[PDB]
Nucleic acid binder design. Structure first.
Ligand SMILES: [Mg+2]
Ligand SMILES: [Zn+2]
Lengths: 257, 33, 57, 166, 101, 89, 55
RNA sequence: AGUUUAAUGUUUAAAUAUUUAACUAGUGAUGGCACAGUUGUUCUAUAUGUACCUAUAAAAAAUAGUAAAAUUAUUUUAAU
RNA sequence: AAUCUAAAUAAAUAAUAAAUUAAAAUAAAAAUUUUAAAAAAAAAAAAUUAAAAUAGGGCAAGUCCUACUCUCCUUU
């Protein structure tokens, strides 16, 4: 009647209209805000995928955004995908604006500085003409073997207008995880921005040692102490990277020779 | 050294005493294949 | 006390589910359902059955 | 010499036994392989019978081209165990001469099998033995002669009621 | 996890600490600190000095199996062999330093 | 169950059997009673359980196939040791 | 549970549309023209062709 | 920041743990070895002396018909 | 507001005479009612079944343990 039929506060449900009514409480019912920690099943909130704490959920929002920017595809699982694609349309809403307010409002959010150095360069060039829906949420078919969580393949939109991921292939992951991704043979004649591909091998440099080949050997002992089925013994885990795989790459840096 | 023979009794060999001697001028053995 | 098992042991074949599988519940059922027939039959079936014949004629 | 009695003319004959059971084991074998069937048992399928078996009764009576499909999709374990057979069994069935295409699943039954006993340690000094269960999987690929393998290349029924009329 | 199926793999090994590739002995030469010692700083102190420590059992290496030879804890983990010169030189008191008579 | 609006007789070898599994008939003095009458033909052919391949996942061959099946969540422990000291005879 | 259940009690379990719809339902599928593998609709591979134009 | 309370836990992560209140100043005391069962020890509560002090361990056939639980073989042939 | 899904996987516990009856109403007869009879007609909650453990009684035979003018040894 004169007061609202259901007074100040009551949680309707998932899948419920706004039913605007005179009230003191504040409801957004709109989420145009970029890089926002408003996780929930309401309208003005992006889907809150499950996590231990709204902090630790924010920590999952960091390493899943800084890994979509780093490599333009992340095979994310479940309610993180609808929660990530809205964070890929925000990063571009952060990378397009450009002002040094935004470049920090992403610097506060990314675990690594080289990313906020990338996101502001390729994306204004890439998405100069696209104005929304920058992330494509294509669902992979085989539900995870570890639980029936679904697996969507959120990838940024057009890469043929990119500068870092020009003609890369993502039909399969890199062989050893420190190896750069396979390239479409029709555009094999592509070179990269140096600051991207000289800082990568700076990172990929630690797995080409033997101290990591010991941490690799070792880890396979942990996963057996914690018994994880199908883990080869650390006695037959011959290294990822090796001297035979050294000779190609030092001679694949013929540019600096 | 210890082990289980195919039968099953733990047949532990006698114990010994590694003694890493340290000669002055190094020694070696050749094996032609 | 002798439960005539070998006289009922092969006749659980026409009881229903749980009685057929297990024996100490299979007998207990039939050695009751049998024990009530031959009590229904001696003292109660006639003065019912001979009333259908009277209701007919 | 042990004799096993067989009747030939209404009277029974004290025929030798070693030659009589070698006539069975060749006949029963020849009376079984000349059939359009292929029975194949996978054992120690690591799953209990309650679970594994109820996920079979969906497959009992399906073409193997369908059974190998309905298996690869469902994330269950029962459907991945049988699909391990339907690629090995038909891999052996095609040797027996059995068709690769027209082959059916006649009987796909679960067989209760070895059950380990694991110690479990409940709270407050009580123990209750968890028994890691394992089953056996009996599978009889039979051959249906006139089975028409239905064409599966149209999106299930997006071919209609989603596409406009005409 | 760019896996699409998590496991003992495709768990991105270091989603931080991007400043990889440290040449310890090379850097240890600049500091003049006994190259064998410096590398020991960067592994759990169980592994180098004579300290009480907890080892995983696979790490211990198995007896000669029918499938695999006797894989000793050393020949699979060389840089984890304790260096008892470096222990004694640093951690234990030598007869010399207290010899009074 | 199953039933496609069709009275297929039921769930075949499944729902009822899993209720009271039959006790195993033990041998007296290791004797099999009717051994001296039944033929010697291999039992694969006697009652009818005649199988072309009895693939056995309890084998060192198929250890890869077993580990292909079990769920990643099905953690198995004591891979590289055993709680009971194996060196006690 | 103050009583054990005969099969006719365990069997009523298998009649509601909860058992049936959870276990005993076949999935509708078809052959992915690109991968030739069985597939459900709305799901695709991790592969350029399967990912640009949804098979 | 490990201890007079309270919540949780209630075959529990625990045959006493999580969180928490209270308390906290020991030159006089978690602690060298020493006392042992008709008995040690006790700032004494019939408390404890190896996870119910009715000590454990060991050896008996104690008693239990004096309302405990049981006591194994159908087709019968004299009653209360 | 927060954290604590379903499903997929692994698979234990108390309890268990049975159930196709269980409901519901009414009388009962020793009892609280439960029966008998008549007459009807998936998930949460704890009203009933034993939702409880175990405390609370008092009686019987048995043993225990403590106490003092009246019973009695081994007694220092
Ligand atoms: Mg009569
Ligand atoms: Zn595909």
């Amino acid at each position: 009647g004169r007061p609202p039929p259901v007074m100040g506060h009551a949680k309707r449900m998932r899948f419920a209209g706004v039913d605007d009514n005179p009230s003191v409480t504040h409801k957004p019912w709109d989420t145009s805000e970029p890089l926002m920690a408003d996780y929930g099943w309401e309208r003005g909130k992006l889907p809150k995928f499950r996590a231990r704490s709204p902090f630790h959920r924010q920590q999952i929002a960091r390493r899943m955004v800084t890994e979509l920017i780093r490599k333009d595809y992340v095979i994310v699982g479940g309610a993180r995908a609808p929660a990530l694609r809205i964070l890929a349309d925000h990063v571009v809403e952060l990378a397009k604006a450009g002002d040094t307010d935004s470049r920090q409002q992403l610097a506060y959010f990314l675990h690594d500085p080289l990313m906020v150095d990338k996101a502001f360069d390729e994306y204004p060039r890439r998405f100069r003409d696209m104005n929304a829906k920058y992330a494509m949420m294509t669902r992979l078919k085989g539900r995870r073997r570890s639980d029936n969580v679904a697996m969507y393949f959120v990838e940024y939109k057009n890469r043929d207008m990119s500068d870092n991921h020009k003609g890369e292939d993502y039909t399969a992951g890199p062989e050893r995880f420190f190896l750069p991704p396979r390239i479409i043979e029709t555009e094999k004649g592509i070179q990269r921005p140096p600051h991207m591909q000289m800082a990568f091998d700076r990172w990929a440099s630690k797995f080409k040692t033997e101290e990591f080949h010991h941490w690799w050997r070792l880890r396979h002992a942990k996963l057996r102490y914690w018994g994880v089925r199908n883990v080869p013994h650390p006695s037959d885990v011959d290294p990822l990277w090796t001297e035979k795989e050294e000779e190609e790459w030092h001679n694949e840096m013929l540019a600096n020779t | 050294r210890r082990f289980k023979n195919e039968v099953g009794e733990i047949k532990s060999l006698p114990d010994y005493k590694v003694a890493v001697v340290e000669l002055d001028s190094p020694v070696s053995i050749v094996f032609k294949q | 006390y002798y439960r005539a098992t070998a006289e009922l042991d092969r006749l659980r074949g026409m009881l229903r589910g749980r009685a057929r599988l297990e024996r100490k519940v299979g007998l207990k059922r039939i050695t009751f359902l049998m024990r009530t027939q031959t009590r229904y039959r001696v003292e109660q079936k006639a003065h019912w059955e001979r009333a259908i014949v009277r209701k007919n004629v | 010499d042990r004799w096993a009695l067989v009747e030939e003319d209404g009277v029974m004959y004290q025929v030798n036994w070693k030659m009589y059971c070698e006539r069975l084991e060749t006949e029963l074998q020849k009376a079984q392989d000349q059939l359009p069937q292929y029975s194949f048992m996978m054992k120690a399928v690591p799953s209990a019978w309650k679970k594994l078996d109820i996920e079979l009764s969906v497959l009992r009576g399906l073409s193997v081209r369908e059974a190998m499909a309905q298996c690869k999709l469902s994330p269950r374990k029962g459907h991945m165990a049988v699909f391990r057979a339907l690629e090995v069994a038909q891999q052996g069935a095609e040797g027996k001469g059995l068709d690769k295409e027209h082959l059916r699943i006649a009987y796909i039954t679960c067989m209760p099998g070895p059950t380990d006993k694991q110690v479990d340690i409940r709270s407050r000094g009580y123990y209750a033995w968890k028994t890691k269960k394992s089953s056996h999987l009996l599978l009889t690929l039979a051959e249906d002669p006139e089975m028409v393998l239905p064409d599966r290349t149209a999106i299930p029924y997006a071919s209609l009621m989603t596409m406009k009329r005409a | 996890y760019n896996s699409f199926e998590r496991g003992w793999k495709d768990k991105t090994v270091h989603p931080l600490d991007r400043r990889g590739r440290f040449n310890l002995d090379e850097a240890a030469a600049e500091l003049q600190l006994d190259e064998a010692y410096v590398a020991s700083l960067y592994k759990p102190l169980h592994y180098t000095y004579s300290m009480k420590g907890q080892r995983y059992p696979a790490e211990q290496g198995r007896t000669s199996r029918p499938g695999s030879l006797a894989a000793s804890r050393d020949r699979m983990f060389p840089l984890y062999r304790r260096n008892y010169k470096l222990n004694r030189e640093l951690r234990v008191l030598d007869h010399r330093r207290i010899s009074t008579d | 169950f199953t039933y496609t609006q069709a009275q297929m007789y039921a769930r075949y070898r499944t729902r009822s059997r899993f209720y009271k599994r039959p006790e195993k008939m033990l041998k007296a003095y290791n004797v099999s009673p009717n051994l001296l009458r039944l033929p010697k033909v291999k039992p694969g052919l006697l009652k009818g359980i005649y199988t072309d391949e009895k693939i056995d996942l309890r084998d060192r061959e198929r250890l890869e196939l077993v580990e292909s099946i079990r769920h990643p969540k099905e953690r198995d422990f004591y891979q590289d040791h055993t709680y009971h000291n194996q060196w006690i005879a | 549970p103050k009583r054990k259940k005969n099969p006719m009690q365990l069997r009523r379990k298998t009649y509601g549309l909860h058992f049936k719809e959870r276990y005993l339902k076949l999935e509708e599928w078809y052959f992915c023209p690109l991968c030739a593998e069985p597939k459900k609709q709305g799901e695709w591979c991790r592969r350029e062709d399967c990912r640009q134009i949804k098979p």
